Amino acid sequence: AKNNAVAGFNALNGVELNLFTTDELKAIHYATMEVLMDPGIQVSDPEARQIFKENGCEVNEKTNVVKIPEYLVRKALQLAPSRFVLWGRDKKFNTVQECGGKVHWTCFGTGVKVCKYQDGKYVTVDSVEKDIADIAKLCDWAENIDYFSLPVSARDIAGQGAQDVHETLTPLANTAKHFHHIDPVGENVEYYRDIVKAYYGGDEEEARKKPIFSMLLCPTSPLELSVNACQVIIKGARFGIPVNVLSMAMSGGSSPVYLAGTLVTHNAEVLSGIVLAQLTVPGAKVWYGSSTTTFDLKKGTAPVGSPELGLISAAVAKLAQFYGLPSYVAGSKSDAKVPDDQAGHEKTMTTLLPALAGANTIYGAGMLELGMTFSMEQLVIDNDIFSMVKKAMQGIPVSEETLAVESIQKVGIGNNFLALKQTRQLVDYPSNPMLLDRHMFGDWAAAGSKDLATVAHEKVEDVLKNHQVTPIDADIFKDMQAIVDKADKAFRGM
Amino acid sequence: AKNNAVAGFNALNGVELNLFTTDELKAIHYATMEVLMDPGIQVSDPEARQIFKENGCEVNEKTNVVKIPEYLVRKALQLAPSRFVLWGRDKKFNTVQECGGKVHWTCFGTGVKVCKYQDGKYVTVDSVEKDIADIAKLCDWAENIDYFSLPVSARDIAGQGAQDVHETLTPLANTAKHFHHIDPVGENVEYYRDIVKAYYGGDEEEARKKPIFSMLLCPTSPLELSVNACQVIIKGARFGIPVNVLSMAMSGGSSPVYLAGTLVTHNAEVLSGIVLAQLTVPGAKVWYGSSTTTFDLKKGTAPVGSPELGLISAAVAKLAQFYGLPSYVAGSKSDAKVPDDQAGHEKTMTTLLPALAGANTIYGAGMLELGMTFSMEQLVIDNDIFSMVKKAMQGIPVSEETLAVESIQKVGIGNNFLALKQTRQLVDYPSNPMLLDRHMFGDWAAAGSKDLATVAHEKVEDVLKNHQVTPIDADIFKDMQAIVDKADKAFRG
Amino acid sequence: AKNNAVAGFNALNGVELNLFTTDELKAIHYATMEVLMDPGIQVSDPEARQIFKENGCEVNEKTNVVKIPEYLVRKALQLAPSRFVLWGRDKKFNTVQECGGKVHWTCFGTGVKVCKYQDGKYVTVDSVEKDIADIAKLCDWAENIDYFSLPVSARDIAGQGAQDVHETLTPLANTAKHFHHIDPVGENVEYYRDIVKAYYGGDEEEARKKPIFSMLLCPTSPLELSVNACQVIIKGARFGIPVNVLSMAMSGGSSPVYLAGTLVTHNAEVLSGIVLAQLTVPGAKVWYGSSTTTFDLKKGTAPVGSPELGLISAAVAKLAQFYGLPSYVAGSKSDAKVPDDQAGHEKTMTTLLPALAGANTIYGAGMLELGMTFSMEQLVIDNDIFSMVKKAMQGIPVSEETLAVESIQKVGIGNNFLALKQTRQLVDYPSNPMLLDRHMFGDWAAAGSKDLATVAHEKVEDVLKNHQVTPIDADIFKDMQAIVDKADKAFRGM
Amino acid sequence: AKNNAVAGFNALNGVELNLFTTDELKAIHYATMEVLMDPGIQVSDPEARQIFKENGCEVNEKTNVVKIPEYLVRKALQLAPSRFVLWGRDKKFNTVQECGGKVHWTCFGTGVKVCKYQDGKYVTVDSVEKDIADIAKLCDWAENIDYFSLPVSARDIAGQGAQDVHETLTPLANTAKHFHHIDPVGENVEYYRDIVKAYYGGDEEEARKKPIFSMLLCPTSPLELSVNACQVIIKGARFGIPVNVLSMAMSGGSSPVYLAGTLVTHNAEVLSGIVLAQLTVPGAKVWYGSSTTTFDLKKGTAPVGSPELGLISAAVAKLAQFYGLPSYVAGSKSDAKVPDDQAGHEKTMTTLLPALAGANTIYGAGMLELGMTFSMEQLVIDNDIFSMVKKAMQGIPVSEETLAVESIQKVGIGNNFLALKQTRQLVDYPSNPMLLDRHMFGDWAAAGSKDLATVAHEKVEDVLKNHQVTPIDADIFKDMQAIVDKADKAFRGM
Ligand code: NA
Ligand code: NA
Ligand code: NA
Ligand code: NA
């Protein structure tokens, strides 16, 4: 009968996107190891500078300049786990972060304005702790949004209390998907530790095992570690909070105009963060990350929706895969000041590259205005664009079955597979976009001839008006909120 | 001193995107052959059937089903030139089509409706012959549209005259660039040949030694070769005109719901058309094309701005590089009825994949509404998109200079490169979009707060109102004009 | 949430076995190419010598020695179909023979003796057409036997008529699988053509489009094309019958002691056949075959159960894949004069190697005594072996599901997977040997303490007295049976 | 003239068997570093448990559940040697165990029954310390048996004396080949260390330098480390006694039905044991071993003669080579009760797969009845198979001399090589089995139509009587024999 015995067969599952060779990967490494020694990094916080020294570095106390020897970069890289798991309040939302090409998406972070609908026209308005609750609710419904990252700032809590300890409980409550705090504060890290230890009722061990709060720090480009960042890392490590050491460098700005040199300036900064982490607590969960892009040597902005942002995040991932770490990179971002043709493009352009390259986590969903405004319409739109990607990422499955030769034959010359059994079993196999319109001119017209913004906007309302977000336990919540009030109290007592 | 010597070094220039492995490529191939022997392929054209029979196929004269032996696919593929040049009336538009990754873009083709303006809004009219004379004018200006493919059908010529011969002189007339005729007629291929022999002054050599015109054809899925097709090929071969054998299958409709299967069906049809071409005139200029997409088993239509399409065009571009022929795949399309947020995503998703796979020619620029409308506005957007795509395909160039180690050092800790000499030199290195906005909310708002559609629209006007298209010779034009006239004459006959 | 998106992942399905680098392959080819020009092969038949001569072959008529130019070796290898399919009378037995590693099995062909059981022990007596009938029925049951190949000879028809023609109708009659004739006779090739054509109701189109018969010739080692072999090709190619150009060299005998060298001699012999096949009729179905083995300079016999046999088939298989042709090779062959311990080892040693190598068709199933005797018992035992192989060929399927991390987890430390949901969905996943006894000592002895030999013998009997075979149509059989007679009478007429 | 200058050339020496890609290794790895953290590994022994905690391991003191951080796996591995040597009392038996594909064989261990010749038939009688004596004498002779591994138990010592110590000196005196103790005891490791120090005469460095004693232990599936096992690792590690950290999972019982998943469990277990040994003593010679098999939920037992076992070992050998350590896998085992066809087959299946993948040590020779009985006949047989296995691993040597185009010509069309020089010189080159019969039928019948089993029985007999085992210096044996006494004496003091 038909064969069912085959010899070794080499296959390709999904889509492979190559940006470097080892000889090239290594060069980028060497150049960074050089830069790490001259000039080195400016580590402002003294405690961190202390840890660096103890472990073998060369710290210049008058200029706060540390020189990291490759052997530490090496050692650091051996301590770090190649994988850890982000937890949610609903285990179903858990998300894994592991050295590989297993792609996950998260929303933008962190904007200051919100693109809400006013009198017929969408209006850019200043964000507030409440806007955060709405986004959080929305992203709790968006499937492709694995976990939540602080979308906008609680500006209205500015000089009022612990805005940062605020941007913690709000998210944890308006969603059950893991929370990634983009704006942490080195001195208030204990507050996050507490708020979580609170969720798991006074039990710390549990909050270390099932962490629901992770944070992001930023090496100040070029070649500097802010005191805020040093404490975020150190506290992040010791307590058990995953730490994303993401970078924001700009070709022609804080790093070379060339993409390659830029990567170096980035690698150096991010690697010094990761090093500082493992020297504090070996096995500290870390993220080799980046949001680096290029400086528009003209317009006067940080274009975050251009191929460069895409290529770099793409590359950053490949570098993370090379170092054995999980990647969190900029992706699905746009410089469009509105959800129009451009927006859709730049979003698709900056996400597909990093995804095919295997970015363990791409952030930018729902963002607009080069990271200034956050649009909920743009989000659900992006959240759909990802589904398309996840299909494309399916690439081409070549098997005797998928080849379907008999199938081709049964149908014969000049017929259709419509009736056929197989065709019916694969009704869902094809990509079925939630918001994209695949209708005739009639169907569409006889439905309002609405553009995607509108189609999406109508979706924004619906979700908000009915999505069901698993709420935090009655008492537990008041325990957590306790730490927030204590944080505001502490704060006002200048 | 500084080093200036290096041993063996393996580099990666560009962005390498992979879909298959050899073992898998072979697999696809066998299915394609295993199918080429059963059921086979229906060849309605009796002259074709003879050509096939003449070489060793099993031409069942009563059903027309030809059966092609792998060895004939082997000789076919060893005859078809791996590369051939396209010529625009303007030498500076020449476009090399060669088995490999050298990618090029060409506008969409060929719809029946145009998305133009009216009263503050865009409206869907029905294509005409004055439209083609404009689409051609724009594409002549569009710097990422290497050559011209028929945009929309000159409807005001149906039953009036030879719509095709009209659809030939009009384009060639309104664009120095090359012309790829989407809907040519097998019985009039000689008309075209002559319209060209004219431009060159009755010199059928300069007409061969400089194809300023090429054509397309689509085997009828699944596994059929329409009569018009076989003649477009046979004549195209005989006259020495570049023929593009593009498939039109639809997973879940005319081909297996699966892609691998769909590729087999596509491979089957496209190849046969290639074998038929070669057996006609060894060395005939052919293409391994495809517009194959998936039938939306949930909307009762053919989504062509979907990731499904993207993957198919990209896969075809590989099967193309595999056998050894130039590719022409369906990319940069969208099922969006309006140049909105969707247009971007869809256009980008579908153009990217083939662009990165190495499609030798990607077409669909300007399209909209699954392929019924041609927005002059989207065309320009897509053209600015292609530009961005290009910077992308440059990936990361890792060299001792691009790594800029010394640069990082002269600037050092906490400073900028704005000053740096090297940086002042690379001012035109970073991607610079023509339409895409990258300003602040302020700057942009004080512009009118124009969305890309509106902005892309004002660009069209500017182009149509001021683009100087290199005009055909005065007489030369009147000569060709006649070929169209005589053609229309015979028509009314 | 749970990951459902991954990029470029290279995987290995099944088990891969390598024998050569492309350089060694090419090298072997180069020897072969030169050996064809010097000394060249001896084409005993004039018709073929002519055919060769016409396409540009230096043909010395005084010695019949033909020299083949590389470009012809090339032309032919490009003319031979990469794939063709064997047809059984039951479309549910059809077997695909196509370049690659799609492994298939067939019984041995063809011994002169039959090893049966008489007075308690095993008795090796001479075969008779009846035996052929019994083997045919037996194999029509065995799953792993894709198709049937003339197992033994009708030594009783010897002298009474044309045995080879009887050797055609009997097999085609006792089994509805495909029939591969190991002993065709060049002059009678037409008799086969008709029995088949007869079967199809005279329609030759159907006989050519659905070959129910195929045959194998043999280059005469070292470097000779016997007329018998020449006619089989020329006539096979013309009629439309799959021809198997299989070599039978012997290291230390008709080829060097080394194996690399024996492969050259073989390669030279086999290709010369294909050159003929294609030059006769372009596109003729062909098989790159071998059963070459090493000679045991010590024992004076050419062992066909030695590792060298296995090594050689494996190599030939690869050589076929190199030239783009389907392969037919030895394997699953033993030298032991009875189904004992030796038997099982040699069977495996020679079937395992060629199999993991991708041989398109392994033949030798149910054979004993250096290819002299056919063992009804060893055929079922072997058949089951082919199963344990098909399983082994699955190797390790590594996917998110196979890794089944959750599975290991839900079960947890110090527990059993016994009553776990997934375990019960894979109840039939493991290898389930039909003969090989996998019972405790107890359960076995309480079943007669039967060794594999006897246990087999019993399932042999059951299969014969109980297996049904799709009979050929009454009307048709007499038509074919008539072709047999028109040949027997004509044989006697001398 | 004749060339003797050739540019770069890629060659494949032997046969290569693949199973995973790197992406797939990384995959299997992560799942092990995922499991190694959750659930974790239960360490029964507190002394070892302390060692884990000491080195940053999170111990759940109450449940005894140790969570091993990936970095401890990485560090453990960096410490472990990539090679070490096994010594025999006879310098000529020294066996190297090194990361790579250098294959070696050792007898099965450790059954409790000896298949011996009763009244004309084979009987399964319970073993005794004496059995070990002879089995040791047998193996000593078997050239394809690198070193000896306690095959049967000194059953007649249970509840009478220090059995395991009897299972030490006994093997050691009845063979000069290295002895691997399959079942050592955590509280007697010191007796062994002393006994060895005795052979060398006080010099412990000699005992460290030339270990003539190694020992194995088995983690408890799934995810457990019995008290005894832990002590084995620790003591062996501290004394400089190699230690085989061999796992014994069962697909469908203690590990996922799938093999990928099972391997993951195998990995977690076998690694933890490696991590322990290392943390206890950096540089402790160890083994990444396994005998994990499948479990026919049907037959009611775990068959160690199935293709599953075959694949598993192979898979484990690769993993072993992946991590840089030596392998000790199960192979050359059978489920058959009597040495019949099944034996010879199942043995070649389980032994060939690992030999090819390149197991650094394969063990299962001389075994039958799913690991219950130890056949002395099957032993001499398996050993002779390994010879055929060894030839097979020679694959095809492609070279100017091996291709031998001159030789092919020197002989020419239709003439043999038997008379040729190159042939008479290579008379020893082909595989020459000791028991596999390659005689024609006639010669065989004369020999008395003896199967392989009995011809094997006659060989065992011939060996047990006449093979001489090197005498341990009489005096030294006294010293050694003495320490075994102190082992018994002490034993009765409880
Ligand atoms: Na694939
Ligand atoms: Na590059
Ligand atoms: Na696999
Ligand atoms: Na070799």
Short mmCIF file of all heavy atoms in Angstrom, two decimals, chain C residues 10 21 253 261 301 308 337 339-345 348 402 417 437 439, chain D residues 10 16 21 253 261 337 341-342 344-345 348 378 402 416-417 431 437-439:
data_model
loop_
_atom_site.label_atom_id
_atom_site.label_comp_id
_atom_site.label_asym_id
_atom_site.label_seq_id
_atom_site.Cartn_x
_atom_site.Cartn_y
_atom_site.Cartn_z
N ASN C 10 14.44 24.49 12.55
CA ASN C 10 14.87 23.38 11.71
C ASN C 10 14.72 22.12 12.54
O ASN C 10 15.18 22.06 13.68
CB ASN C 10 16.33 23.58 11.30
CG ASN C 10 16.63 25.01 10.93
OD1 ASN C 10 17.11 25.29 9.83
ND2 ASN C 10 16.34 25.94 11.84
N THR C 21 30.29 12.04 1.70
CA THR C 21 30.25 13.49 1.61
C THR C 21 30.07 13.65 0.11
O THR C 21 30.26 12.69 -0.64
CB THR C 21 31.58 14.16 2.05
OG1 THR C 21 32.67 13.56 1.34
CG2 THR C 21 31.79 14.00 3.53
N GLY C 253 35.87 -10.99 -5.67
CA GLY C 253 35.54 -11.94 -6.72
C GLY C 253 35.40 -11.29 -8.08
O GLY C 253 36.25 -11.49 -8.93
N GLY C 261 35.51 0.30 -3.96
CA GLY C 261 35.79 -0.26 -5.26
C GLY C 261 34.65 -1.10 -5.82
O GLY C 261 34.32 -1.01 -7.01
N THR C 301 32.31 -18.97 0.30
CA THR C 301 30.93 -18.63 -0.01
C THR C 301 30.76 -17.12 0.11
O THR C 301 31.51 -16.47 0.85
CB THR C 301 29.95 -19.30 0.96
OG1 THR C 301 30.21 -18.85 2.30
CG2 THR C 301 30.09 -20.80 0.92
N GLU C 308 28.69 -6.27 5.50
CA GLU C 308 29.04 -5.76 4.18
C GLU C 308 27.84 -5.73 3.24
O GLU C 308 27.71 -4.80 2.44
CB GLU C 308 30.18 -6.58 3.57
CG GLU C 308 31.56 -6.16 4.05
CD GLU C 308 32.20 -7.17 4.98
OE1 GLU C 308 31.45 -7.81 5.76
OE2 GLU C 308 33.45 -7.31 4.94
N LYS C 337 21.18 -21.53 7.99
CA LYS C 337 20.36 -22.54 7.34
C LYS C 337 19.13 -22.93 8.14
O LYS C 337 18.77 -24.10 8.18
CB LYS C 337 21.19 -23.79 7.05
CG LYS C 337 22.00 -23.73 5.76
CD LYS C 337 23.03 -22.62 5.77
CE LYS C 337 24.11 -22.89 6.79
NZ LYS C 337 25.22 -21.91 6.67
N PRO C 339 15.69 -20.72 10.74
CA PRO C 339 15.30 -19.52 11.49
C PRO C 339 15.70 -19.52 12.98
O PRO C 339 14.86 -19.70 13.86
CB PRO C 339 13.78 -19.46 11.29
CG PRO C 339 13.42 -20.90 11.16
CD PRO C 339 14.50 -21.43 10.24
N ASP C 340 16.99 -19.30 13.24
CA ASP C 340 17.52 -19.29 14.60
C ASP C 340 17.94 -17.90 15.05
O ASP C 340 17.45 -16.90 14.55
CB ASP C 340 18.75 -20.21 14.68
CG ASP C 340 19.88 -19.74 13.79
OD1 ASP C 340 19.80 -18.59 13.29
OD2 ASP C 340 20.85 -20.50 13.58
N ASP C 341 18.86 -17.87 16.02
CA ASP C 341 19.39 -16.62 16.57
C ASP C 341 20.12 -15.88 15.46
O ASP C 341 19.91 -14.69 15.23
CB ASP C 341 20.37 -16.94 17.71
CG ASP C 341 20.30 -15.93 18.85
OD1 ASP C 341 20.38 -14.72 18.57
OD2 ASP C 341 20.17 -16.34 20.02
N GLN C 342 21.00 -16.61 14.76
CA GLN C 342 21.75 -16.02 13.66
C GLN C 342 20.76 -15.31 12.76
O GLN C 342 20.87 -14.11 12.51
CB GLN C 342 22.48 -17.11 12.87
CG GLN C 342 23.47 -16.59 11.85
CD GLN C 342 24.06 -17.69 10.99
OE1 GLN C 342 24.51 -18.72 11.49
NE2 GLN C 342 24.06 -17.48 9.68
N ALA C 343 19.77 -16.06 12.28
CA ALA C 343 18.73 -15.53 11.41
C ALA C 343 18.32 -14.10 11.77
O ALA C 343 18.58 -13.16 11.03
CB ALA C 343 17.51 -16.44 11.43
N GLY C 344 17.69 -13.95 12.93
CA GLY C 344 17.23 -12.64 13.38
C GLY C 344 18.26 -11.53 13.31
O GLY C 344 17.95 -10.41 12.88
N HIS C 345 19.48 -11.83 13.73
CA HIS C 345 20.55 -10.84 13.70
C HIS C 345 20.85 -10.37 12.28
O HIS C 345 20.75 -9.19 11.98
CB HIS C 345 21.83 -11.42 14.30
CG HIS C 345 23.07 -10.70 13.89
ND1 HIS C 345 23.20 -9.33 13.99
CD2 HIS C 345 24.23 -11.15 13.35
CE1 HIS C 345 24.39 -8.97 13.54
NE2 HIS C 345 25.03 -10.06 13.14
N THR C 348 18.15 -8.34 10.55
CA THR C 348 18.17 -6.96 11.03
C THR C 348 19.42 -6.19 10.56
O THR C 348 19.31 -5.10 9.99
CB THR C 348 18.11 -6.94 12.57
OG1 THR C 348 16.90 -7.57 13.01
CG2 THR C 348 18.15 -5.52 13.09
N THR C 402 5.16 16.69 22.00
CA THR C 402 5.98 15.53 22.35
C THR C 402 6.79 15.78 23.60
O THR C 402 6.95 14.89 24.42
CB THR C 402 6.94 15.15 21.23
OG1 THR C 402 7.62 16.33 20.78
CG2 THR C 402 6.19 14.50 20.09
N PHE C 417 2.25 7.95 35.01
CA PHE C 417 1.51 8.55 33.90
C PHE C 417 0.35 7.64 33.46
O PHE C 417 -0.43 7.98 32.57
CB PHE C 417 2.44 8.79 32.70
CG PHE C 417 3.37 9.96 32.87
CD1 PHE C 417 4.40 9.92 33.82
CD2 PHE C 417 3.22 11.11 32.10
CE1 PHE C 417 5.26 11.02 33.99
CE2 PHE C 417 4.07 12.22 32.26
CZ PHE C 417 5.09 12.17 33.21
N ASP C 437 7.61 -12.10 21.37
CA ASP C 437 6.99 -12.29 22.67
C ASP C 437 7.54 -11.35 23.73
O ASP C 437 8.73 -11.38 24.05
CB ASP C 437 7.18 -13.75 23.10
CG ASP C 437 6.45 -14.08 24.38
OD1 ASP C 437 6.81 -13.52 25.43
OD2 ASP C 437 5.51 -14.90 24.32
N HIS C 439 6.32 -11.07 27.05
CA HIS C 439 5.64 -11.47 28.28
C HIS C 439 6.63 -11.88 29.35
O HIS C 439 7.79 -12.17 29.05
CB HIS C 439 4.69 -12.64 28.03
CG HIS C 439 3.44 -12.27 27.29
ND1 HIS C 439 2.49 -11.42 27.82
CD2 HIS C 439 2.99 -12.62 26.06
CE1 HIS C 439 1.51 -11.27 26.94
NE2 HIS C 439 1.79 -11.99 25.87
N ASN D 10 36.63 16.74 1.70
CA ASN D 10 35.75 16.40 2.83
C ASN D 10 35.42 14.91 2.79
O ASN D 10 34.97 14.39 1.76
CB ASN D 10 34.46 17.19 2.75
CG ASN D 10 34.69 18.65 2.58
OD1 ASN D 10 35.32 19.30 3.42
ND2 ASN D 10 34.20 19.20 1.47
N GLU D 16 27.35 7.72 9.99
CA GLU D 16 26.82 8.77 10.86
C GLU D 16 25.31 8.64 11.00
O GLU D 16 24.59 8.52 10.00
CB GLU D 16 27.17 10.14 10.30
CG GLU D 16 26.87 11.29 11.24
CD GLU D 16 27.26 12.62 10.65
OE1 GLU D 16 28.26 12.66 9.90
OE2 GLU D 16 26.58 13.62 10.94
N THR D 21 18.37 18.27 15.59
CA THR D 21 19.06 19.42 15.01
C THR D 21 19.53 20.13 16.28
O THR D 21 19.31 19.63 17.39
CB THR D 21 18.12 20.38 14.24
OG1 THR D 21 17.08 20.84 15.12
CG2 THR D 21 17.49 19.68 13.06
N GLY D 253 4.57 5.17 31.86
CA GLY D 253 4.54 4.75 33.25
C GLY D 253 5.05 5.85 34.16
O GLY D 253 4.29 6.43 34.94
N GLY D 261 9.25 13.76 25.39
CA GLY D 261 8.94 14.04 26.78
C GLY D 261 9.74 13.15 27.72
O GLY D 261 10.33 13.64 28.69
N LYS D 337 12.73 -15.16 25.76
CA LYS D 337 13.12 -16.03 26.87
C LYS D 337 14.24 -16.99 26.52
O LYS D 337 15.16 -17.20 27.30
CB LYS D 337 11.90 -16.79 27.39
CG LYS D 337 11.28 -16.15 28.63
CD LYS D 337 10.81 -14.71 28.39
CE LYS D 337 9.65 -14.63 27.41
NZ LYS D 337 9.07 -13.26 27.35
N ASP D 341 15.09 -16.63 17.19
CA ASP D 341 15.15 -15.61 16.15
C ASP D 341 14.99 -14.26 16.84
O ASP D 341 15.81 -13.36 16.66
CB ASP D 341 14.02 -15.81 15.12
CG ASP D 341 14.54 -16.25 13.75
OD1 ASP D 341 15.56 -15.71 13.29
OD2 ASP D 341 13.92 -17.14 13.13
N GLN D 342 13.95 -14.14 17.66
CA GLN D 342 13.68 -12.91 18.39
C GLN D 342 14.95 -12.37 19.06
O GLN D 342 15.30 -11.21 18.88
CB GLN D 342 12.60 -13.16 19.45
CG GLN D 342 12.20 -11.94 20.27
CD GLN D 342 11.01 -12.21 21.18
OE1 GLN D 342 9.95 -12.63 20.73
NE2 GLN D 342 11.18 -11.96 22.48
N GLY D 344 18.33 -12.81 18.58
CA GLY D 344 19.22 -12.27 17.57
C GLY D 344 18.76 -11.00 16.89
O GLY D 344 19.58 -10.19 16.46
N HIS D 345 17.45 -10.82 16.78
CA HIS D 345 16.91 -9.63 16.15
C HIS D 345 16.86 -8.48 17.15
O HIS D 345 17.53 -7.45 16.97
CB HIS D 345 15.51 -9.91 15.61
CG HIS D 345 14.66 -8.69 15.46
ND1 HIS D 345 14.87 -7.75 14.47
CD2 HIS D 345 13.60 -8.24 16.18
CE1 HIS D 345 13.99 -6.77 14.59
NE2 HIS D 345 13.20 -7.05 15.62
N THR D 348 20.11 -6.95 17.90
CA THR D 348 20.72 -6.13 16.86
C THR D 348 20.01 -4.79 16.73
O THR D 348 20.64 -3.78 16.38
CB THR D 348 20.70 -6.89 15.50
OG1 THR D 348 21.42 -8.11 15.64
CG2 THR D 348 21.36 -6.06 14.42
N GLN D 378 23.94 -16.71 24.81
CA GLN D 378 23.58 -15.45 24.17
C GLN D 378 24.73 -14.46 24.32
O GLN D 378 24.86 -13.54 23.51
CB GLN D 378 22.32 -14.88 24.80
CG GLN D 378 21.78 -13.68 24.06
CD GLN D 378 21.49 -13.99 22.61
OE1 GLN D 378 20.48 -14.64 22.29
NE2 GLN D 378 22.37 -13.56 21.72
N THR D 402 41.07 2.53 -2.17
CA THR D 402 39.86 1.73 -1.99
C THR D 402 38.94 1.70 -3.21
O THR D 402 38.21 0.73 -3.41
CB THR D 402 39.04 2.21 -0.79
OG1 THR D 402 38.86 3.62 -0.87
CG2 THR D 402 39.74 1.84 0.49
N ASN D 416 37.82 -12.81 -12.45
CA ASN D 416 37.76 -12.53 -11.02
C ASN D 416 39.05 -12.01 -10.39
O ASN D 416 40.10 -11.96 -11.04
CB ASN D 416 37.23 -13.76 -10.25
CG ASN D 416 38.19 -14.92 -10.24
OD1 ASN D 416 39.03 -15.04 -9.34
ND2 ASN D 416 38.09 -15.77 -11.25
N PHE D 417 38.95 -11.62 -9.12
CA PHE D 417 40.08 -11.07 -8.38
C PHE D 417 40.73 -12.09 -7.45
O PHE D 417 41.84 -11.88 -6.96
CB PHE D 417 39.63 -9.86 -7.55
CG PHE D 417 39.19 -8.68 -8.37
CD1 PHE D 417 38.18 -8.81 -9.32
CD2 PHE D 417 39.78 -7.43 -8.18
CE1 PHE D 417 37.75 -7.71 -10.06
CE2 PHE D 417 39.37 -6.33 -8.91
CZ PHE D 417 38.35 -6.47 -9.86
N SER D 431 34.51 -9.15 7.01
CA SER D 431 33.98 -9.56 8.32
C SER D 431 34.06 -11.07 8.47
O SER D 431 33.57 -11.81 7.62
CB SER D 431 32.52 -9.11 8.47
OG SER D 431 31.65 -9.75 7.55
N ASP D 437 27.12 -18.94 10.93
CA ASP D 437 27.48 -19.91 9.90
C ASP D 437 27.34 -19.37 8.47
O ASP D 437 26.27 -18.91 8.07
CB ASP D 437 26.64 -21.19 10.07
CG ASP D 437 27.33 -22.44 9.52
OD1 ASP D 437 27.51 -22.54 8.28
OD2 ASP D 437 27.70 -23.31 10.32
N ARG D 438 28.44 -19.44 7.72
CA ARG D 438 28.47 -18.99 6.33
C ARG D 438 28.86 -20.15 5.41
O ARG D 438 29.29 -19.95 4.27
CB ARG D 438 29.46 -17.84 6.16
CG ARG D 438 29.07 -16.59 6.91
CD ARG D 438 30.08 -15.48 6.72
NE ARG D 438 29.70 -14.31 7.49
CZ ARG D 438 30.34 -13.15 7.46
NH1 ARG D 438 31.41 -13.02 6.69
NH2 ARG D 438 29.92 -12.13 8.21
N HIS D 439 28.73 -21.37 5.93
CA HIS D 439 29.04 -22.56 5.16
C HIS D 439 27.80 -22.87 4.34
O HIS D 439 26.69 -22.50 4.72
CB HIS D 439 29.32 -23.74 6.09
CG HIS D 439 30.70 -23.75 6.66
ND1 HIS D 439 31.83 -23.79 5.87
CD2 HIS D 439 31.14 -23.76 7.94
CE1 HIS D 439 32.90 -23.82 6.64
NE2 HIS D 439 32.51 -23.80 7.90
#
